[PDB]
């Protein structure tokens, strides 16, 4: 189990750690989060009490370094930093645990939710989407736009998701215009899976990461990316059986976890109705269709 200590909490803030969250009052004696499960990526995120505008946060993996949070009063936000002095870090964490000034990552033992949401998400791939090479962790916020959004404006602060565009020369082979537009298998299997992602695990990892950025930061370009990657699979007549079964599990846990009050803005009626009821894969997503119909029958 690993720890992310905080130097202090000078401003009132709601702090999230993965799917959990808790309120910290201005100058409350809070010094971080302990017992974080090893083996998964994690995200620690913030919403200031004064300005609920801008949710922001950091993706990280405790196996890649000792990380801590420190408020910056010039830039006005909680910043993740790496501590290179290992002895200094262990000494700090040990003292904070002794004084019991840390919250415990509150995982229930039955609960595989976080694993199920991050199964294919790797920190190495996160850092290729979020380019900031001098850090081992990655910053995301509500306002960051994607590379495809910038084509339709600061390149350094963008989300470099894989561009998917159904009406593009990449998606459409000359002389197969109708075939490739109505059945996207070529684009899924040859262009994207064989050509760009190399395997389905990397594809699912990007999909899972796009969902999580949409849910935790309200990042619109991330929501667009999540829906596009779902639609590309659902609009392909030829998809490996293992990929469909895994997609059903992935989406099931995403829909299960999504906040009920956010479904109106985070779920695209057209994509979901197409995928569940009109697409080639309309009969292949049993778990997802069942939870969607019982939880969001309005959307459909």
């Amino acid at each position: 189990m690993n720890t992310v200590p905080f130097t202090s909490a000078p401003i009132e803030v709601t702090i999230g750690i993965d799917q959990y969250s808790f309120n910290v009052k201005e100058n409350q004696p809070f010094h971080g989060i302990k017992d974080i499960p090893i083996g998964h990526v994690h995200v620690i995120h913030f919403q200031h009490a004064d300005n609920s505008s801008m949710r922001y946060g950091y993706w990280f993996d405790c196996r890649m370094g000792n990380f801590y949070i420190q408020y910056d009063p010039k830039d006005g936000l909680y910043k993740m930093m790496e501590e290179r002095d290992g002895a200094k870090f262990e000494n700090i964490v040990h003292n904070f645990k002794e004084r019991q000034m840390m919250v415990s990552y509150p995982k229930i033992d039955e609960d595989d939710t976080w694993y199920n949401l991050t199964e294919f998400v790797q920190m190495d791939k996160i850092r290729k989407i979020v380019r900031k090479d001098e850090n081992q962790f990655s910053y995301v916020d509500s306002s960051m736009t994607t590379v495809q959004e910038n084509e339709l404006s600061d390149p350094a602060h963008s989300l470099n998701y894989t561009v998917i565009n159904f009406k593009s020369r990449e998606a459409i082979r000359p002389g197969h215009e109708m075939e490739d537009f109505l059945d996207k298998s070529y684009y899924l299997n040859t262009v994207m899976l064989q050509g760009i992602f190399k395997n389905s695990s990397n594809y699912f990892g990007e999909l899972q990461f796009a969902f999580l950025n949409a849910m935790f930061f309200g990042n619109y370009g991330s929501s667009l990316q999540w829906h596009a990657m779902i639609e590309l699979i659902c609009s392909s007549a030829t998809v490996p059986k293992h990929m469909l079964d895994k997609l059903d599990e992935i989406l099931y846990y995403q829909i299960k976890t999504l906040p009920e009050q956010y479904s109106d803005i985070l779920l695209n009626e057209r994509v979901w109705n197409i995928c569940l009821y009109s697409s080639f894969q309309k009969n292949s997503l049993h778990n997802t269709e069942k939870i969607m119909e019982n939880k969001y029958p309005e959307l459909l």
């Binding site: 009406k167 020369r169 459409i172 215009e177 537009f181």
Partner: protein, 237 residues
């Protein structure tokens, strides 16, 4: 965006543009089979591609052999239209290629956009107008060449005859739409109006009779009449 009443004048500016109408591409007769079921028999169709400024009509005849062994023909017909329009653009010199293609049905937008990805600078646009180009097959010489075709074939027509010698492209396209609206509302009456006087003939190289200016105003009024009439007969007014 979409073409509507508010921007009707754009059609007659000097940017090359084409209307594409696919209504008559996939045509069938419905009939009973010996067992008393229903079946369709396709007949020849055509794509109607028209430059509204010049009157140039590129009439691509769709021979029934293109449907042989194919499924979902109404959907295929939209993609076949898009393929043929794309091939026509590619066959024209660059300075003759359109800057805009306006489709008369919104269902052509995606098929045409996809077939024209190579031409990112050609704008594909819908229209809010209810243009009467489906009645093109009520023009006898056009229907005759479509029905006689035994193979795919492109046939070139000036749909305005020689009118642009005497009138503007806005008055010509306005007249063409009036004649086609009439033919669509009551074909027999419209054709009666156009042909009643045997002394006004259709030249071998024309589609419509050789009316004087004065006779065209009479004709247009009579077509202005018919369309209100059949509107009363239909609606009881």
């Amino acid at each position: 965006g979409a073409m509507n009443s508010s921007n009707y004048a754009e059609l007659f500016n000097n940017d090359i543009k084409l209307f594409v109408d696919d209504t008559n591409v996939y045509r069938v007769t419905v009939h009973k089979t010996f067992e008393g079921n229903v079946a369709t028999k396709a007949i020849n169709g055509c794509i109607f591609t028209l430059n509204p400024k010049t009157g140039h009509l590129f009439l691509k005849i769709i021979h029934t052999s293109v449907w042989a062994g194919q499924k979902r023909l109404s959907q295929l017909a939209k993609w076949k239209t898009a393929e043929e329009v794309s091939a026509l653009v590619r066959s024209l010199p660059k300075e003759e290629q359109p800057k805009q293609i306006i489709v008369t049905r919104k269902a052509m937008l995606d098929p045409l956009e996809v077939h024209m990805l190579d031409f990112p600078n050609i704008a594909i646009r819908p229209t809010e107008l209810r243009l009467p180009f489906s009645a093109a097959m009520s023009i006898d010489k056009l229907s005759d060449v479509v029905m006689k075709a035994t193979e795919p074939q492109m046939v070139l027509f000036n749909i305005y005859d020689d009118w642009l010698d005497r009138i503007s492209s806005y008055t010509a396209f306005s007249r063409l739409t009036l004649l086609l609206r009439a033919l669509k509302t009551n074909e027999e009456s419209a054709k009666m109006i156009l042909l009643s006087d045997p002394t006004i003939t259709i030249k071998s190289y024309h589609l419509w009779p050789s009316f004087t200016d004065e006779q065209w105003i009479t004709i247009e009024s009579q077509m202005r009449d018919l369309i209100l009439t059949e509107y009363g007969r239909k609606y009881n007014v």
